[PDB]
Nucleic acid binder design. Structure first.
Lengths: 61, 58
DNA sequence: ACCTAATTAGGCGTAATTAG
DNA sequence: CTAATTACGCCTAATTAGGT
């Protein structure tokens, strides 16, 4: 345990992620690193986001 | 329990803050809360009750 | 009687957590 | 990792207790 509150993403970081979601919806470490760098977000947030998007796109349909 | 008071000046800063952003993000609420000196509850509540007033007549 | 600022219970997205 | 669930934050609108 080490505190983990919500973030809120903004259309910009979102758009950047969505743009990065194409090309590779399952990015390895480096790609997530530079995405974190481009966005400022914590790695885990990028990761959990991508997980969630994969889940979302598979969710339907 | 308060009824945590308002003061003119803070409220001045506040309607001044109302412009540019009808309903802001936590950054705004924070720095605003700092300039005011009251808890985020206090800020969000006023913003809310203003959110339930501007439309009340409009 | 006004003013307003606090709950109060409810619904909505979706990030974060958990099961598996 | 996936697939399902939970928790949070973020907003509403109708009360609920204040104040000069």
């Amino acid at each position: 345990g080490a505190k983990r509150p919500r973030t809120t993403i903004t259309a910009k970081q979102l758009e950047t992620l969505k743009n990065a979601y194409k090309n590779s919806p399952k990015p390895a470490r480096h790609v997530r690193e530079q995405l974190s760098s481009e966005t400022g977000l914590d790695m885990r947030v990028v990761q959990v986001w991508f997980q969630n998007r994969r889940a979302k796109e598979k969710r339907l349909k």
